[PDB]
Amino acid sequence: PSWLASALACVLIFTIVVDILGNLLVILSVYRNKKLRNAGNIFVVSLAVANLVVAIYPYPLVLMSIFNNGWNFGYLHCQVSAFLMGLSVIGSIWNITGIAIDRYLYICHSLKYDKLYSSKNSLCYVLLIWLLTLAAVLPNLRAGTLQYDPRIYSCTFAQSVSSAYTIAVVVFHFLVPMIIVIFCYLRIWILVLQVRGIDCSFWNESYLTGSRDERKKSLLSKFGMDEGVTFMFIGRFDRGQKGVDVLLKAIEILSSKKEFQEMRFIIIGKGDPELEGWARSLEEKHGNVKVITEMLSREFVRELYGSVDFVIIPSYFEPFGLVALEAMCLGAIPIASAVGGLRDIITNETGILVKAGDPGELANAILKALELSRSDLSKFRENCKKRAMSFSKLKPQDFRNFVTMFVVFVLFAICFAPLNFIGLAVASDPASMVPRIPEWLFVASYYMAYFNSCLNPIIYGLLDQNFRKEYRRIIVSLCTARV
Ligand SMILES: COc1ccc2[nH]c(-c3ccccc3)c(CCNC(C)=O)c2c1
Fold first, then answer.
1. DSSP code of residue 200
2. Domain end: 357, 392, 427, which one?
3. Which of 95, 215, 249, 263 would bridge 47 by S-S if both were Cys, CB 3.0 to 4.6 A apart?
4. Centre of ligand 1 from the C-alpha of residue 449, in Å
5. Does residue 132 share a domain with residue 15?
6. How far apart are CA 383 and CA 477, in angstroms?
7. Within 6 Å (CB) of ligand 1, which residues are found?
8. Which range marks the domain in which residue 142 is found?
9. Nearest residue CA, atom 8 of ligand 1?
């Protein structure tokens, strides 16, 4: 239809104008604003340079080609314009990966140190990204996989020339970065929820009265057992979640060992009546095993964390693991499954890590925990506290920039997911699938991808307070005369 042709031209005109003005504002703002002048934003400047390239030479030729309803320029213009569109779109996905790693390394640095993370080698990594993308786009000139597509009025990467090239492009320059970025932002989100989650004004040693040795002697006395190395579990009783069954099997393995006499176990929780029986059975057979099926208050749990020597976390699946942080507040050394969430909290100096679902490896860990002398235990406890303390320090920070960068990525993925999905579909049978795929779907997936080249300036102005203020600062400074 006549309107379908002129509609596409509007989209490109809009994309071009917004891209040039908007990305000039992004590059200006970063070098103008002191807060935006960080080296971690070098990745944002190269991304704006990548976005700008397509609007000066390739996109205006595509716009002219709509009106000509054909390629009226040379084969060389068809090759160079197709090439620079490659450099831009491949450069931008890798630059987005660069930001995703930079930000994940920034949160980790602020957790371990009081000094601000300085992305010192950031400019050196941007030079590797453009060497990586130039290495990926350049083989296409000799392969002859760049040609004109009448359906979208442009010269681009033809997905039907050779399926091997298109499969590799979809795998290495879309799926691989996707997995890396999804991993970076997932690990960031969990660490923010842990920062949010902890309460240092509740889980605080100040509320505990005497000495640790005293508190423990008193706790054990109430339970009717002598002084020993005491271990505690606090969780639901279930087959494949919190792993009280791995702990129960471990207590059985240790009951034949001489070293068991020196051990004390406080198992707290409820759930499977079978796992309740097994636990009550070990309680009757051994006077160093105590089970608490009742529900205890935060206050009493806080006293237990400040008395017991170790907290066992034998979980199969533990997304956040606030329990470990809560225990570390009151100097309880955790022995926990090296699963997600707990591996982020427990460092090698602040606890013992074990492979989930192995009663043998847990039994040996408990034996290793027993062999630790008072002196080693004091440093371990001190470390545990310095680790909990580093989580709560990040509480007043502004986590808005993480959201803006995440939105910049999410929108990139939406714009390019159809193109890459079609890419795969065409790769399966280029001869058969070129007609079998709808024309509206094809034209939409290409112009959606083109539209992405103007989105980042709009996002920065809508979610980042600094970019919003600076955009206005520049606009006025150029349009308000001096007299
Ligand atoms: C591999 O070398 C090149 C070379 C030139 C290229 N130009 C484009 C492209 C630019 C803007 C919008 C859509 C596609 C790609 C991306 C091509 N991806 C797919 C799935 O066909 C490209 C790749």
1. T
2. 392
3. 95
4. 10
5. yes
6. 52
7. 82, 85-86, 89, 137, 140, 156-157, 159, 166, 169-170, 419-420, 423, 446, 449-450
8. 2-197+398-479
9. 86
Among 78, 89, 93, 166, name the best residue to mutate to test ligand 1's pocket (greatest count of ligand atoms within 8 A of Cβ): 89
Q: Using CA atoms, how far apart are residues 71 and 82, in angstroms rounded to an integer? A: 12
DSSP conformation class of 271: B
Determine the Cα–Cα distance for residues 263 and 119; give it in Å rounded to an integer: 48
Measured from the CA of 174, which atom of ligand 1 is nearest? 20
Question: To which residue do tokens 């790769």 refer?
Answer: 427
Do 224 and 370 lie in a common domain? Answer: yes
22/157 same-domain check: yes
Within this chain, do residues 376 and 415 fall inside the same structural domain, yes or no?
no
Residue positions forming the annotated binding site for melatonin: 140, 159
- CATH code where residue 339 lies: 3.40.50.2000
- By alpha-carbon position, which residue is closest to atom 7 of ligand 1? 86
| Resolution value in angstroms | 2.9
DSSP conformational letter for 148: E
Q: How far is CA 138 from CA 22, 130, 132, 289, 462, in A?
A: 29, 12, 10, 69, 36
Residue with tokens 């309803």: 69
Experimental approach = X-ray
Residue at a domain's end among 392, 424, 459: 392
Helix (H, G, I), strand (E, B) or coil at 116: coil
Based on the domain organization, do 69 and 183 belong to the same domain? yes
Same domain? For 366 and 474 the reply is no
Residue 362 CA neighbour count, 13 Å, CB half: 29
CA of 401 to the centre of ligand 1 (A): 29
| d(CA 123, ligand 1 centre) in Å | 25
